[PDB]
Design a protein around this ligand. Structure first.
Ligand SMILES: O=[N+]([O-])c1cc(C(F)(F)F)ccc1NCc1ccsc1
Lengths: 110, 108
């Protein structure tokens, strides 16, 4: 059974700058509904600071993966457990600012 | 001349290198529609002269969890090859996430 997941790209602040259409099946929103918003806008109040802090640290970790579990508000306003695996990228031919690549999977908290 | 964003595309793969996702940036670059790539192994697209090296990089990626490929050639949809470099990352294994950047025009 394939896990349900989608890829996203974020600026270092956490704003969605790209969203894979598999988001509709995963969390119920169209890409347009996510683009331009901070991931933290979709995050459970108890988990928001952890997510901020995760985004802050992933840029320090030399491009290694940082994982975070958090509750994501679906299009139906229900809290879905997500495991987001995130890493930085920047084109080595450039000095343009790093951005963050996430794979976001709906997982069990059990 | 193309900007940086326009020369990069993201792909996702199963552990066997079969495409499970590819962003649409590949179309302008290499000609493929993402939907025609799904279920096809990345190996189907490597130049013969890069195949042994890509096998080794795949091995490194699976062993270590991350890899930067050497420069390699990907077969283009309408013939010829484009030079690429890829940063690969295993997501735990669940799948492989690739950041692919084009290093050349299509060469025939
Ligand atoms: O999909 N891969 O498993 C993969 C691995 C490697 C590396 F050699 F670094 F391990 C590089 C690229 C890909 N996938 C992307 C791709 C594969 C053929 S054309 C674009």
């Amino acid at each position: 059974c394939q896990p349900t997941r989608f890829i996203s790209r974020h600026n270092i602040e956490g704003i969605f700058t790209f969203v894979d259409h598999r988001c509709v099946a995963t969390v119920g929103y169209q890409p347009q509904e996510l683009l331009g918003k901070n991931i933290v806008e979709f995050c459970h109040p108890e988990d928001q600071q952890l997510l901020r802090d995760s985004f802050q640290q992933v840029v320090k970790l030399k491009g290694q993966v940082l994982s975070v579990m958090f509750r994501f508000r679906s299009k139906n306003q229900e809290w879905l457990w997500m495991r987001t695996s995130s890493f930085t990228f920047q084109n080595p031919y450039s000095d343009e600012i790093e951005y963050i690549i996430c794979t976001n999977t709906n997982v069990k908290n059990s | 001349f193309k900007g940086l964003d326009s020369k990069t595309f993201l792909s996702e793969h199963s552990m066997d290198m079969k495409f499970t996702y590819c962003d649409d940036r590949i179309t302008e670059l290499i000609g493929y529609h993402p939907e025609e790539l799904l279920g096809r192994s990345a190996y189907e697209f490597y130049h013969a002269l890069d195949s042994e090296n890509m096998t080794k990089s795949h091995q490194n990626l699976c062993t270590k969890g991350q890899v930067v490929s050497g420069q390699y050639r990907m077969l283009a949809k309408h013939g010829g090859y484009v030079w690429l470099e890829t940063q690969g990352t295993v997501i735990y294994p669940q799948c492989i996430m690739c950041v692919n950047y084009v290093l050349s025009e299509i060469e025939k």
